[PDB]
Design an enzyme around this catalytic site. Structure first.
Site, short mmCIF file in Angstrom:
data_model
loop_
_atom_site.label_atom_id
_atom_site.label_comp_id
_atom_site.label_asym_id
_atom_site.label_seq_id
_atom_site.Cartn_x
_atom_site.Cartn_y
_atom_site.Cartn_z
CD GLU A 247 -1.13 0.44 3.68
OE1 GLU A 247 -1.27 -0.24 4.72
OE2 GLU A 247 -1.65 1.57 3.53
N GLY A 248 0.36 2.31 -0.63
CA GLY A 248 1.02 3.61 -0.62
C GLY A 248 0.18 4.65 0.09
N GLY B 255 -3.05 4.79 -2.72
CA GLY B 255 -3.75 3.51 -2.72
C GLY B 255 -2.80 2.34 -2.80
CB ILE B 256 -3.35 -1.31 -2.49
CG1 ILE B 256 -4.54 -1.69 -3.40
CG2 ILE B 256 -3.82 -1.05 -1.07
CD1 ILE B 256 -4.27 -2.86 -4.33
CG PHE C 79 6.63 -6.49 -11.59
CD1 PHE C 79 6.18 -6.08 -10.33
CD2 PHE C 79 7.57 -7.50 -11.67
CE1 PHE C 79 6.67 -6.68 -9.18
CE2 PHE C 79 8.06 -8.11 -10.52
CZ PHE C 79 7.61 -7.69 -9.27
N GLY D 183 2.29 10.97 -8.45
CA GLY D 183 1.00 11.46 -7.97
C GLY D 183 0.97 12.85 -7.35
CG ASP E 197 6.70 12.06 -2.51
OD1 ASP E 197 7.17 12.57 -1.46
OD2 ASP E 197 6.12 10.95 -2.53
N1 LIG Z 1 5.66 -1.03 -10.76
C1 LIG Z 1 6.06 -1.40 -9.52
N2 LIG Z 1 6.73 -2.56 -9.32
C2 LIG Z 1 7.14 -2.94 -8.10
N3 LIG Z 1 6.93 -2.22 -6.98
C3 LIG Z 1 6.27 -1.02 -7.03
C4 LIG Z 1 5.79 -0.54 -8.34
N4 LIG Z 1 5.19 0.64 -8.11
C5 LIG Z 1 5.27 0.90 -6.77
N5 LIG Z 1 5.92 -0.10 -6.13
C6 LIG Z 1 6.19 -0.16 -4.66
O1 LIG Z 1 4.99 -0.32 -3.91
C7 LIG Z 1 5.04 0.48 -2.72
C8 LIG Z 1 3.65 1.00 -2.35
O2 LIG Z 1 3.21 2.00 -3.27
P1 LIG Z 1 3.71 3.53 -3.19
O3 LIG Z 1 4.71 3.71 -4.30
O4 LIG Z 1 4.10 3.84 -1.76
O5 LIG Z 1 2.38 4.36 -3.56
P2 LIG Z 1 2.20 5.94 -3.24
O6 LIG Z 1 2.93 6.26 -1.96
O7 LIG Z 1 0.72 6.20 -3.28
N6 LIG Z 1 2.95 6.86 -4.53
P3 LIG Z 1 2.48 8.53 -4.80
O8 LIG Z 1 1.85 8.55 -6.17
O9 LIG Z 1 3.77 9.31 -4.70
O10 LIG Z 1 1.50 8.81 -3.68
C9 LIG Z 1 6.04 1.60 -2.99
O11 LIG Z 1 6.86 1.83 -1.84
C10 LIG Z 1 6.86 1.12 -4.17
O12 LIG Z 1 8.21 0.86 -3.77
#
Ligand SMILES: Nc1ncnc2c1ncn2[C@@H]1O[C@H](COP(=O)(O)OP(=O)(O)NP(=O)(O)O)[C@@H](O)[C@H]1O
Length: 301
Positions: free
Chosen positions: A40-41, A44-45, A108, A171, A151
């Site tokens: 999750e970010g 979102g996930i 990926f 984002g 970011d």
């Molecule tokens: N294409 C991908 N392949 C593998 N891992 C990924 C990929 N995209 C994102 N991730 C990982 O998944 C984790 C969770 O998603 P995240 O990038 O934290 O979303 P987020 O924080 O919403 N990004 P933002 O758009 O800046 O808000 C991240 O820490 C990345 O390291």
């Protein structure tokens, strides 16, 4: 981990209607199998999936529309990756709208985040330079079109299996033009935030350069400055104190040191630009994608 930070019919339904027009039509599940969450970010996930026909792997970011910090920032996820197809930028294949969710289908990245590597082991200068080059190459192109990433952190940087570096997580992107001089919104992760951004003063593309400065401290020292402190007064310390220095400049080559001295400048007018830094002698040390492979979890310790 500190989460990224940003400061109803008509509201929702209109915003959905907007995104509907922006994205590709249909549903991705018509050709994708095995949606399994990865992490999750803030928006979102992120989850993995497979192309049914070929069997090849893709990633799918799922972001809820009504569960956003500030909805309008969702447009970045589609547009930024659509336009700026670059060697050091995560490819986007497609974007779709599914119920209350935006579904961006991107490539990926096997190697995972740079966060994983920064905290576990600690890289040599040759490898650190290789990263900085890849990020600056991408950031120069974005700054060229007046696009701030807002970011920059180890979490935003991802790797392939063969050690190639790409920038991700767009984002929070901002736009700046002839008629738009600077932005002024409080956006980004607390520690990686520039000093002028924390004082809420009008800021340009320079806040990314500083953020990279903090990301250099990450690779070297393991943590961003004041990472142990709560974000609130950690931001005040960045606003008040002098530019954060490295632990000890003993093992650090003067090449890298002089490099970082251009990154972490308080006055953004004096702070170096992505264009300049691409010609800095330190980036000549940048090793091949192959020299990053040993750092990754699969071959670590
Ligand atoms: N294409 C991908 N392949 C593998 N891992 C990924 C990929 N995209 C994102 N991730 C990982 O998944 C984790 C969770 O998603 P995240 O990038 O934290 O979303 P987020 O924080 O919403 N990004 P933002 O758009 O800046 O808000 C991240 O820490 C990345 O390291």
């Amino acid at each position: 981990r500190p989460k990224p930070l940003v400061d109803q019919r008509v509201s929702h339904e209109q915003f959905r209607a907007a995104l509907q027009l922006v994205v590709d039509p249909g549903d991705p599940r018509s050709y994708l199998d095995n949606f399994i969450k990865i992490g999750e970010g803030s928006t979102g996930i992120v989850c993995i999936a497979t192309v049914r026909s070929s069997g090849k792997l893709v990633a799918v970011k799922k972001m809820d529309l009504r569960k956003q910090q500030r909805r309008e920032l969702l447009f970045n996820e589609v547009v930024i990756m659509r336009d700026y197809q670059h060697e050091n930028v995560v490819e986007m294949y497609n974007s779709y709208l599914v119920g209350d969710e935006l579904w961006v289908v991107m490539e990926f990245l096997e190697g995972g985040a740079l966060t994983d590597i920064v905290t576990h082991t600690r890289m040599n200068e040759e490898q650190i330079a290789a990263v900085c080059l890849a990020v600056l190459q991408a950031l120069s192109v974005l700054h060229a079109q007046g696009v701030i990433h807002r970011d920059i952190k180890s979490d935003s940087i991802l790797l392939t299996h063969d050690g190639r570096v790409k920038l991700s997580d767009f984002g929070f992107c901002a736009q700046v033009s002839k008629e738009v001089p600077r932005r002024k919104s409080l956006v980004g992760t607390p520690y990686w935030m520039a000093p002028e951004l924390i004082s809420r003063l009008p800021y340009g593309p320079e806040v990314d350069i500083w953020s990279l400065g903090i990301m250099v401290i990450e690779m070297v020292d393991g943590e961003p400055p004041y990472f142990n402190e709560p974000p609130l007064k950690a931001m005040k310390m960045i606003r008040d104190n002098l530019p954060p220095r490295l632990k000890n400049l003993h093992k650090v080559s003067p090449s890298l040191k002089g490099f970082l001295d251009r990154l972490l400048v308080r006055d953004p007018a004096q702070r170096a630009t992505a264009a300049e830094l691409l010609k800095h002698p330190f980036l000549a040390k940048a090793g091949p994608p192959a020299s990053i492979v040993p750092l990754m979890r699969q071959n670590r310790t």
